[PDB]
């Protein structure tokens, strides 16, 4: 007796391993990924996060990527040396076990992911999906 | 930081204009103080609605010439370093991308012979600049990356000193203006250049009173 | 000779003594501003001296209470003239 | 409007001062406050425009 | 820990870059105290967006040559020493393995010719390296040991001068820079670097100055 | 055991809101606690190896 957990937390893709894709928060409250690897990473990656603003042109069509800034806790003492968001997925995952995380504060409308610079053949062995919550409207 | 205290113009108190030395690269910031001439004209002050003009008065004219080129976003970029500088003698050329003066969002494989390749970061949409130098002639290239539906504009190819568009700002409470003044990587050490500030205050009713000064920018190497 | 000088003031004493270290000239306004003073305000000195009242009542007092970025201290009063002598 | 768009209230205002952070010149206090609002069945009500 | 308070781009107060000793093999700290530049420029302080850059302004090419080699894990390791010393006039060969700059994680016996075995420590891979002196010239000879799955890359032949990869700090309370600055054990005493540092400071609300300094470092013998 | 090593309490675990570092919406706690030991004479006692 499993349910049509579908609406309710639906999911999409967001990084397939060879293209990024955003994904639309506006309806949602709440939000995070789900990474999960292919096949055995070879050093740590890091992706970037962005956040897309509603096009001038039409507003159901994603704007320019813009990078969301980073937001420390108390905790944080490394502060990744930018104040520009980013996860890193580190070495030793085997590619039987997901990680999740996500940003503490969304702005605008859309979210994405995309690997950042030095680890951009690793991130073709990985992929990066987003489940939100409730729906506001 | 700069600072220059203007003369308050009562018929009271080597070259006409102040000092300002610079160094190629540095972006630095400058201060003035109209207290002294507006402080008697009482009215509202000081308003921002000051104007500058920037003058070359020993250019040495550059021997390596800049350019402009397009790429989508996520696509690679290719082209030439060598169509650039016409040399008139004939000798090699020992092209380099200064470390210091590299891309903001991308990479760059200097090749061996004026080749390179220019990978934008990803999901990245804007332009980025970085200063090449042949045989020691700096010169800068401008790459904007469109956001795959038409185009952006052509950037005006930053000149070897100017003020950037609006980081000023005038204290009327204590008649303190602020700006900021750069200095390209392309700036040739000896030239100078010469700015003149022509600042507008107010009366108590709203006319003007019109200030005009300028400044003797030299550009020297090592500070 | 025929200087002038900016340069800030401490009020001193409880009928306000302003003390010039350079004896405004003669009869020129010297222009006191900032220090909350709504408007710059201007006072004739005595010939040749450096001691000035300053006027107990108030023009403006633009006080900004209530802020985190200078805990609204205060901007400090200065004075503006000239000195020394003409030929 | 009853109906179609509606205003939730959590906690009013609340000030308190800032003990740490006041450096025995600048006495600071905070204040907060938690609300919010949302719009309901949005086919009661129409807008007129020019 | 050297300390160099930097120039204050005010107009005022024999080579231009200050001076940097060094002693090969050592690996020492440096401050650096922009406040007297950056403290006026009301802002956010600094930010970890300093860039470093090493030339060389006297190299005097190395003797020796440098050589890489591969390996699994618990295999151990051969390998000569002769054809690394190009001599062009004709000398003996005194081999010698300094107990100093020996192997990190592993351990070699020096042969009587050019010789020498390289058995790496059980249960261990990586990268190791160790600083041969062939008749009193210097290099190094860099070995991976591989987890005998497929291969490993290539390690980048560290350089006579470095400043390590992310060592640097900053402390926007007080306006300092520190960093770690490293010499090879293979510098040649004599010579002379020269190291530029751009430090970027940021105004309140995200826009950017600029400074540029260098400094000289000579790479001396006995402190 | 009751002479061969001592056990020392100066200050038992204690628990404390750090005012300071602490804001209108975040806390910080600050624990701790302060003892040591020594031997007594350790001819007391005795060991035994392989």
């Not at chain 2, 100078?192 to 005009?212: M, W």
Request: some cysteine; overall charge negative.
């Amino acid at each position: 007796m499993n349910f049509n957990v579908g609406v309710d937390f639906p999911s999409f893709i967001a990084w397939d391993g060879e293209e990024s894709f955003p994904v639309k928060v506006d309806g949602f409250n709440q939000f995070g990924f789900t990474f999960k690897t292919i096949a055995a990473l070879t050093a740590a990656t890091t992706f970037n996060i962005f956040y897309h603003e509603p096009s001038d042109a039409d507003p159901c069509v994603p704007g320019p990527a813009i990078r969301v800034p980073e937001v420390p806790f108390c905790d944080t003492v490394l502060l990744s040396e930018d104040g520009l968001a980013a996860v890193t997925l580190p070495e030793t995952v085997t590619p039987d076990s997901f990680c999740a995380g996500t940003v503490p504060c969304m702005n605008g409308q859309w979210i994405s992911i995309a690997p950042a610079t030095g680890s951009e053949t690793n991130a073709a062995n990985v992929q990066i999906t987003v489940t939100m919550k409730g729906a506001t409207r | 930081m700069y600072f220059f205290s203007v003369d308050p113009r009562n018929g009271a108190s080597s070259c006409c204009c102040e000092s300002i030395s610079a160094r190629p690269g540095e972006v630095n910031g400058v201060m003035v103080s109209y207290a002294a001439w507006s402080a008697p004209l009482r009215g509202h002050g000081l308003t921002n609605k000051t104007t500058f003009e920037i003058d070359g008065v020993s250019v040495t004219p550059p021997k390596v010439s800049n350019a402009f080129g397009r790429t989508k976003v996520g696509v690679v970029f290719e082209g030439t370093l060598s169509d650039l500088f016409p040399n008139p003698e004939g000798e090699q050329v020992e092209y380099e991308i200064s470390e210091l003066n590299g891309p903001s969002n991308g990479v760059v494989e200097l090749g061996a012979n004026g080749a390179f390749t220019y990978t934008p970061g990803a999901l990245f949409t804007g332009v980025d600049r970085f200063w090449f130098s042949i045989n020691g002639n700096i010169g800068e290239y401008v790459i904007s990356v469109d956001p795959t539906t038409s185009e952006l504009p052509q950037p005006p190819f930053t000149t070897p000193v100017y003020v950037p568009a609006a980081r000023r700002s005038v204290d009327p409470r204590t008649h303190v203006l602020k700006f900021v003044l750069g200095v390209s990587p392309a700036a040739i050490p000896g030239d100078v250049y010469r700015l003149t500030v022509r600042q507008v205050a107010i009366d108590c009713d709203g006319n003007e009173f019109v200030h005009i000064s300028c400044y003797d920018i030299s550009i020297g190497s090592c500070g | 000779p025929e200087k002038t000088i900016v340069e800030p003031i401490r009020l001193k004493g409880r009928r306000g003594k302003i003390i010039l270290s350079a004896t405004p000239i003669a009869g020129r306004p010297v222009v006191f501003y900032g220090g909350g003073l709504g408007s710059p305000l201007e006072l004739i000195p005595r010939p040749g001296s450096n001691v000035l009242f300053f006027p107990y009542g108030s023009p403006d007092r633009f006080q900004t209470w209530g802020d985190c970025h200078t805990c609204d201290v205060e901007s400090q009063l200065m004075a503006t003239y000239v000195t020394g002598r003409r030929c | 409007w009853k109906t179609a768009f509606y205003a939730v209230e959590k906690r009013p205002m609340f000030f308190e001062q800032y003990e740490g952070g006041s450096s025995a010149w600048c006495v600071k206090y905070q204040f907060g406050a938690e609300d919010g609002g949302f719009v309901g069945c949005c086919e009661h009500g129409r807008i007129l425009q020019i």
